[PDB]
Amino acid sequence: LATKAARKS
Amino acid sequence: MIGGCCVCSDERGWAENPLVYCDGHGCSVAVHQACYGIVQVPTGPWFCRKCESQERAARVRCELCPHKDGALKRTDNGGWAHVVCALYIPEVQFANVSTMEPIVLQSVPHDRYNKTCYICDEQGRESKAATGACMTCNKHGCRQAFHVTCAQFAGLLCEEEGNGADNVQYCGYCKYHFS
Ligand SMILES: [Zn+2]
Ligand SMILES: [Zn+2]
Ligand SMILES: [Zn+2]
Ligand SMILES: [Zn+2]
Ligand SMILES: [Zn+2]
């Protein structure tokens, strides 16, 4: 599951 | 000081993304696995990075705001920073997005440290207002500045969809411009 950090632009 | 996850505020957990609670003495951190980069959720007590470290809360504060609770990670310069501050300040980076640590400050522009938080200032806290880094209201044209954590408790933060597969744009709005 992708973390919040990995999703940051 | 926050009920559910203290990073995203969601109160619901999920089968492969559970709420994890720190058993740290005097600590009330609760975060989703995916909100703190927990590699493997233990089948027992779990401790946040701060409670695992070797110094008391007196010195362990976020470099980016004046708020004291919440989920911290170590920084570049061997300091500490909120995960949520790192998300909503655009130029803050993570060295490893999987483990979400350390928090990388070094690309944060001087212009983020020379602002005053308006939320802090309307509360009449002029020392707190100048502390740390501010994000800027995402409204086009508005230049209102505020601590990420201050907008969090004012309910001024939000995760908007971004261009890309699953890119999130973590942003905020001053009291004038929310929705
Ligand atoms: Zn969360
Ligand atoms: Zn803790
Ligand atoms: Zn912070
Ligand atoms: Zn503030
Ligand atoms: Zn605004």
Domain boundaries, chain B: 19-172
Q: Which residues of B touch A1 (CB under 8 A)?
A: 16-17, 33-34
* B62 touches B128 (CB < 8 A): no
**Residue A9 DSSP code:** -
Q: CA B153: distance to chain centroid?
A: 12
Give CA–CA dist B4/B18, Å, rounded: 11
Q: B19-172 falls under which CATH superfamily?
A: Zinc/RING finger domain, C3HC4 (zinc finger) (3.30.40.10)
Q: How far is the CA of B134 from the centre of ligand 4 (A)?
A: 8
Partner-chain contact B98 A6, CB within 8 Å = yes
Give CA–CA dist B103/B109, Å, rounded: 15
Give the Å distances, CA to CA, from B101 to B36, B53, B104, B164: 9, 14, 8, 23
Give CA–CA dist B142/B132, Å, rounded: 20
Solved how? Answer: X-ray
Partner-chain contact A7 B37, CB within 8 Å = no
The H-or-E segment that residue B129 falls in is: helix B126-130
Q: Which residue does chain A place closest to B14, by CA atoms?
A: A1
Partner-chain contact B33 A4, CB within 8 Å = no
The C-alpha R_g of chain B, in whole angstroms, comes to 16
In this structure, what token pair is assigned to residue B34?
């995916």
Q: Which residue does chain A place closest to B104, by CA atoms?
A: A5
The set of residues, in sequence order, having a beta carbon less than 8 Å from that of B55 and lying 6+ positions away, is none
Residue of B92, B97, B166 best to disrupt the A interface, most CBs of A under 10 A: B97
Partner-chain contact B94 A5, CB within 8 Å = yes
Strand, helix or coil at B83?
Answer: helix
